[PDB]
Structures are given as structure tokens and as C-alpha cells.
């Protein structure tokens, strides 16, 4: 009867908690790159597209997308600075 009242608690609150957003200063550098590459990995060639949308669409028609200085000089050096195995 001592516990026969309700679900123990909606949540259990721990009197001690997390410290902070630890290592605060320097992960501004990594933290933007977290969002930088994710902006570029999604907009990459190495991804797949929902061709199941286009086989789902029987409404295909014209006028819609569904229907539609490197300044450098030559050189050649091939180094074996790396392993000679496998």
C-alpha cells in the first residue's frame, strides 16, 4: 500500500546533473563543420534519389521539373610515400 498510489513518478529527477556544454571555446570550429559538411554531403553526387516518387506520379506533364577559373599548371609526380602492402 506504501507504493500503491500511482506510476512511481512521471520522471525521476537526479539532484546532480550534467556539467555544461563542456569544452566550450574550440568546438565552435568543429561545430560549424558538423553543419558545413552536412550541407554538402546531402547536396553531393554520392547520394540517392526517390525514383519511387516518379513511378508513383502518373501526372507527368511538360513545364514541370518532373519533366525536365581553376588557375593551374601541369605537373606529374606519383609518390610512394605510403604503404606497400595488401
Amino acid at each position: 500500500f506504501s507504493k500503491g498510489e500511482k506510476l512511481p513518478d512521471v520522471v525521476l529527477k537526479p539532484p546532480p546533473l550534467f556539467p555544461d556544454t563542456d569544452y566550450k571555446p574550440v568546438p565552435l570550429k568543429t561545430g560549424e563543420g558538423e553543419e558545413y559538411m552536412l550541407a554538402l554531403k546531402q547536396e553531393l553526387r554520392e547520394t540517392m534519389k526517390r525514383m519511387p516518387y516518379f513511378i508513383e506520379t502518373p501526372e507527368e506533364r511538360q513545364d514541370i521539373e518532373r519533366y525536365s577559373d581553376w588557375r593551374r599548371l601541369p605537373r606529374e609526380m606519383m609518390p610512394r610515400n605510403k604503404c606497400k602492402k595488401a
Binding site: 500500500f1 506504501s2 500503491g4 506510476l7
Partner: protein, 506 residues
Amino acid sequence: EQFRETDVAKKISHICFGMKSPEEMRQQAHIQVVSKNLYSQDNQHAPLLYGVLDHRMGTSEKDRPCETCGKNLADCLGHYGYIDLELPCFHVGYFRAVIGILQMICKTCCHIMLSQEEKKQFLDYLKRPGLTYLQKRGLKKKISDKCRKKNICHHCGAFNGTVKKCGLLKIIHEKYKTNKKVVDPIVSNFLQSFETAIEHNKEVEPLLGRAQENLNPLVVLNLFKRIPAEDVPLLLMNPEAGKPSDLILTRLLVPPLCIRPDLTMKLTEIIFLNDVIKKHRISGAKTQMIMEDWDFLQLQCALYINSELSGIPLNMAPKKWTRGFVQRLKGKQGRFRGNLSGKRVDFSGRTVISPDPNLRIDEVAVPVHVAKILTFPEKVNKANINFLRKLVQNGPEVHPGANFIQQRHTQMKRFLKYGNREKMAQELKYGDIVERHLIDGDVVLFNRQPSLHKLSIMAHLARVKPHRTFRFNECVCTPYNADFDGDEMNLHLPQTEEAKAEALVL
């Protein structure tokens, strides 16, 4: 407007036996019976509380409705509830399987101890398309054989020795055995550096050599948690059905109240035990006391799954015999034989059997009393309309009469005696069902209870006679092995046209 929603029914193609993860149990449970160790009958007027009888998991009394739905005892299915075990415990059903996984996996890094070359051969065997249940049991014995034969590991070199089910619900593993060969330094340091323990306990110094890892539910939980996904197939577990961790118990689904109109008493004891250990930890209780409480809670959970549990400790032996879940599915009175293979059946009668040489071999004389009680449902079909109306007029008391009428639109049955029979006869329309009394020419199945061959059930045509006794021709008594020295035989009336025809033809 309104969408097109189809209404239809389906058949069971393949039962896939599986388990449920402790998170998956909570998903199907509607409430948490973490409530009272009290019975839940409230202090005044016997109403339900928030615990085991929560009426949110069903109703076992017709008057009180359930809380998930407004359905009454008849219309409700069942709803489930959960009890969160404070210290993890083993399931006695899966315990031998648990000892097997520990022998198969490395106690330290947890990968099955099957050589990389050996693993490839076995994995292909599993890939073979026709793996019947028989083949799978076979591989486990073989894979297990190689592993119990692998004291070292191809993964980390951790030394994994013998897991041997010591005691009841206890698993014991070597790790640090003592041998005539020079002892390894790590084991020697473990057994020689506890000087204070040797000083405090005199018995420890002579027995200092003996010391093996004891695998308790808490260690098993972590080890089973860390087995690789790749290595769950070679443990011969279907990963979709279950995974190694679900073998150890964290939450128990409390049964729907429909399935329990002594199991409930066991649940209250388990709830009380869960409260005692939790209070003891806050109070500050010795580990041996906490382990004894853990053992008592483990025993109560096992007594819930399998009541007899041979090997019970003397101190915690059960006060009374209780029927836990195994003792409900086992035995002649058990659900499998008592309620599934053989079932009590309606539309049947048992009377003493007497001789009648004047009856054809295909006929049985049925007492007029049994004929009035036993009824066959006949649908008005344009050829029986005149005959049915006359029997409706005769009503329940007269022998060529009916005891109920069901209209085509509704499943409601109107008793002929209480109402006006003449009006119902006129109202009769094609497609309504009249439960006429058994009449001459009906097909009944006759059965002698000590049935030993095919001929103990035989059909018979039924011809009602005044005397009370099932009288048949005496030529057909050696198939029944029935003499008339006080014998009684059973009559069954098939209630479908498809069943009637199979009985007459076959």
C-alpha cells in the same frame, strides 16, 4: 464525403513464435501495476484501486466495465499491464538456454567462441535454404560442442571454461581455475592479494585456491547486451523474433484480468517483494540480506512461471500448492488437453441405453424429453415455410414444435413460449432461422465413452419414442462394445448442413 473502408476477415497463415523486449512489453501494456501490494479492493464497498485489479486491464465481473474500452465482460478482449522488476531476474523457462549462451560466448568480450574458419562453414550451413527446426537444433549441439571445447578465445584470448548450473537458478563459470601446471600470474594475484579477507575469515585461507566467477542476472544482462549482431544467428536465435538480452527478466507483463477470474495472489507477493528490496536498499541492508531478498523475488517469479520448480530451497518452500502459468497448460485437466484437443460441447445428451429390435440398423430412438431440449436451426427456404409455420404454432411444449425464432436482420432470439406464437408464424419470411425440435429423420452422432476404434462414434438417424432411454438395434452393439448392463451413451446433434451431410455420407 466519406472514404471507402473495406470490412473483411483473414486466416492464420503462419504462427511465428517469438519473444518481446522489455521496452516492447511497455508498448503493449496500458497501465503500470506498480501499485499496491494491497489487493486493490478499495477500503470501502470492495471497488478496484490502481494496482493488480485495475479494471484498466479488463473486467472479471459482468456488472463492472473495463476502462480502456466501455465493453462488458463478454465484449472486451483483454488489456495488459506491467510490473518493473527492481533487480533483474532469470526466466525459469529460458534458464537452460541462458547457461547454453554463456558456454558458447566469451564471458569477457562476448563473441561466440567459433573459429573464424569454423564460423564461415557454419554460417553457410545456416544460409542453406531448407533449415527445418530439426536441423537448427542439430547445429546448436554441434556449435556448442566445439565451443565447450574452446577454453581459449579466437577473439581476445580470454579464458572461458565451464558454465554448470549450480543449485536452483544459479550459473557458475571458471575464469580462474587452479591446476597442477604453474598458476597464471593474474589468477594467482587475485587469490593471494586479499590478505585482510584471509585475516578476517579463518576458513578462507585453506579454501583460498577455490574462487570462480559467479554469473548472476546483472552480469548476464550486460554480457547478453554486448553480443555482436553477426553472432546472434550462430546462437541460433532468430533476431526478428528475439535477441539474447530478452531471455533475462526486467519487466513482467501482468496478465489481462479476463484470464484470471491464485496467479493474482502470486503477482501481489511479487509486488510486495519489489517494494521490500527497494526499501531495504534505502534503509541500508547487508548484501547477503539483499541477495536473499533477490533470491526470494527470483523464486517467486519462477513459482509464477512454473509452480513445482523441483529443487526448491527449504527456507522459501511454497506454503500451499498454486497453479502458475505452466500448471495451467499441462496435464489432462490442463488447457492443452482439457480445453483445446477436447472441449465440452453444446447440443448433446447422455442417457442409459436399452434394446429395440424393431428399429432399422440406421436408426436410434430418442426420448421425447431430450428431443424437446435439443434443437436444430432450420432457415425458412420456400420448401419448409408451410412446415415451419405449423411447428411454430405448436410451440415449445408440443413435440413437433420450435423453442426460438431468429429474424434475418437481427441475431436476437425470441422465445416462442413468452410471446404470441400465431403472430410470429405469420411474420415468418425467407431467410429467418427457426430452432425446431429434433424430429424424425434427423441425423445424430452416437458415441460410447471408452472409444477404442473408429466404430465407437457412429451416426444414426433419430426417431423420437415416448420411453426415456437411448434404444438401438442390438446388431450394432459389438462396434460400441456395449452391453446393456447399465451402460450410458452420448448423442450429439450436428448444427450445420455441411456437418449433417458428412455424418450421413461418412
